[PDB]
Chain A
Amino acid sequence: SEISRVYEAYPEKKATLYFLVLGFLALIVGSLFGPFQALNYGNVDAYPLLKRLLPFVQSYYQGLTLHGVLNAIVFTQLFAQAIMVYLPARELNMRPNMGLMWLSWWMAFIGLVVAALPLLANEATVLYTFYPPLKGHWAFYLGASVFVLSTWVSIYIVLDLWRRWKAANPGKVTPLVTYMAVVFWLMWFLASLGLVLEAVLFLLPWSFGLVEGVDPLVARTLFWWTGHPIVYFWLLPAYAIIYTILPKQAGGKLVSDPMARLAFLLFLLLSTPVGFHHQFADPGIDPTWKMIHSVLTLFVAVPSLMTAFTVAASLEFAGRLRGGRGLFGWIRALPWDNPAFVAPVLGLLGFIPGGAGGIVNASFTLDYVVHNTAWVPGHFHLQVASLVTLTAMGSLYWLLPNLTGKPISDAQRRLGLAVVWLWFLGMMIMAVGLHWAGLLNVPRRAYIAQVPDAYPHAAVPMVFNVLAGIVLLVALLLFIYGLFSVLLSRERKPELAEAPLPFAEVISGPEDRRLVLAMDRIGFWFAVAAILVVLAYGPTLVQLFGHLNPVPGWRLW
Chain B
Amino acid sequence: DEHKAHKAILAYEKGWLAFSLAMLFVFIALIAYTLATHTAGVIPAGKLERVDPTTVRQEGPWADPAQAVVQTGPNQYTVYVLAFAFGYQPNPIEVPQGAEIVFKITSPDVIHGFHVEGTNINVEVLPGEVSTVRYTFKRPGEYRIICNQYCGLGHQNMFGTIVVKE
Q: Does B130 contact A (CB under 8 A)?
A: yes
Q: Which residues of B contact A283 (CB under 8 A)?
A: 44-45, 49, 123-124, 126, 129-132
Which one, B17, B50, B109, B121, contacts A305 given CB within 8 A?
A: B17
The segment from A3-11, A102-110, A189-197, A445-453 found at the interface with B is: A445-453
Q: Which residues of A contact B17 (CB under 8 A)?
A: 302, 305-306
Cα separation A544 to B20 with both chains bound (whole Å):
36
24 sampled A-B residue pairs with Cβ under 8 A:
A131-B111, A216-B126, A281-B44, A284-B47, A284-B126, A287-B35, A298-B27, A298-B28, A305-B16, A305-B17, A306-B13, A306-B17, A309-B12, A317-B9, A369-B120, A441-B146, A444-B148, A445-B149, A445-B155, A446-B156, A450-B156, A509-B7, A544-B48, A556-B152
Most chain A CB within a 10 A radius of its CB, from B12, B28, B154: B28
Q: Which residues of A contact B66 (CB under 8 A)?
A: none
Q: Which residues of B contact A256 (CB under 8 A)?
A: 6, 9-10, 13
Chain B contacts with A in 1-19, Cβ cutoff 8 A: 2-3, 5-7, 9-10, 12-13, 16-17
Check A61–B150 contact: CB distance below 8 A: yes
Interface 1/0s, chain A 359-380, versus B by CB < 8 A?
1000111111101110000000
Check A556–B3 contact: CB distance below 8 A: no
Most chain A CB within a 10 A radius of its CB, from B9, B113, B115: B9
Cα separation A253 to B7 with both chains bound (whole Å):
15
Check A255–B111 contact: CB distance below 8 A: no
Q: Does A547 contact B (CB under 8 A)?
A: yes
Q: How distant is A522 from chain B, measured CB to nearest CB, in Å?
A: 23
Check A259–B13 contact: CB distance below 8 A: yes
Q: Which residues of A contact B6 (CB under 8 A)?
A: 255-256, 507-509
Q: Does B54 contact A (CB under 8 A)?
A: yes
Query: Do A549 and B50 form a contact, CB below 8 Å, given A317-B5, A368-B120?
Result: yes
- Given A298-B27, A509-B3, 8 extra CB contacts under 8 A: A217-B128, A283-B130, A298-B24, A310-B9, A507-B5, A552-B54, A556-B110, A556-B151
Query: Do A313 and B45 form a contact, CB below 8 Å, given A217-B126, A365-B31, A372-B115?
Result: no
Cα separation A367 to B34 with both chains bound (whole Å):
12
Cα separation A317 to B9 with both chains bound (whole Å):
10
Which one, A60, A286, A447, A509, contacts B46 given CB within 8 A?
A: A286
Q: Does B127 contact A (CB under 8 A)?
A: yes
Classify chain A's interface size. 35 or more
Task: Please name the residue on chain B nearest to A64 by beta carbon.
Answer: B150
Cα separation A87 to B101 with both chains bound (whole Å):
58
Task: Please name the residue on chain A nearest to B16 by beta carbon.
Answer: A309
Check A217–B129 contact: CB distance below 8 A: yes
Chain B contacts with A in 98-144, Cβ cutoff 8 A: 109-111, 113, 115, 117-118, 120-124, 126-132
Q: How distant is A98 from chain B, measured CB to nearest CB, in Å?
A: 40
Q: Which residues of A contact B132 (CB under 8 A)?
A: 283
Cα separation A270 to B43 with both chains bound (whole Å):
24
Check A216–B128 contact: CB distance below 8 A: yes
Q: Is the interface of A mostly helix, strand, loop or mixed?
A: mixed
Interface 1/0s, chain B 32-43, versus A by CB < 8 A?
101100011011
Most chain A CB within a 10 A radius of its CB, from B20, B85, B121, B128: B128
Q: Does B82 contact A (CB under 8 A)?
A: no
Cα separation A309 to B10 with both chains bound (whole Å):
10
Cα separation A302 to B153 with both chains bound (whole Å):
41
Q: Does A101 contact B (CB under 8 A)?
A: no
Q: Does A498 contact B (CB under 8 A)?
A: no
Cβ-closest 5 pairs across A and B:
A556-B152, A372-B148, A443-B148, A286-B46, A445-B150
Q: Does A476 contact B (CB under 8 A)?
A: no
Q: Does A154 contact B (CB under 8 A)?
A: no
Q: How distant is B144 from chain A, measured CB to nearest CB, in Å?
A: 9
Check A291–B31 contact: CB distance below 8 A: yes
Check B149–A372 contact: CB distance below 8 A: yes
Which one, A61, A282, A359, contacts B126 given CB within 8 A?
A: A282
Task: Please name the residue on chain A nearest to B21 by beta carbon.
Answer: A302
Which one, B3, B42, B45, B50, contacts A368 given CB within 8 A?
A: B42
Q: Does A133 contact B (CB under 8 A)?
A: yes
Task: Please name the residue on chain B nearest to A362 by beta carbon.
Answer: B27
Cα separation A547 to B39 with both chains bound (whole Å):
30
Q: How distant is A371 from chain B, measured CB to nearest CB, in Å?
A: 5
Check A371–B128 contact: CB distance below 8 A: no
Most chain B CB within a 10 A radius of its CB, from A369, A507, A544: A507
Task: Please name the residue on chain A nearest to B2 by beta carbon.
Answer: A507
Q: Which residues of A contact B20 (CB under 8 A)?
A: 302, 305
Most chain A CB within a 10 A radius of its CB, from B28, B85, B124: B124
Which one, B3, B13, B131, contacts A310 given CB within 8 A?
A: B13
Check A294–B43 contact: CB distance below 8 A: no
Query: Do A557 and B153 form a contact, CB below 8 Å, given A281-B124, A305-B20, A372-B122?
Result: yes
Interface 1/0s, chain B 65-78, versus A by CB < 8 A?
00000000000000
Q: Does A59 contact B (CB under 8 A)?
A: yes
Cα separation A291 to B46 with both chains bound (whole Å):
12
Chain B contacts with A in 74-102, Cβ cutoff 8 A: 85
Check B127–A443 contact: CB distance below 8 A: no
Cα separation A448 to B126 with both chains bound (whole Å):
23
Cα separation A303 to B154 with both chains bound (whole Å):
42
Cα separation A367 to B20 with both chains bound (whole Å):
21
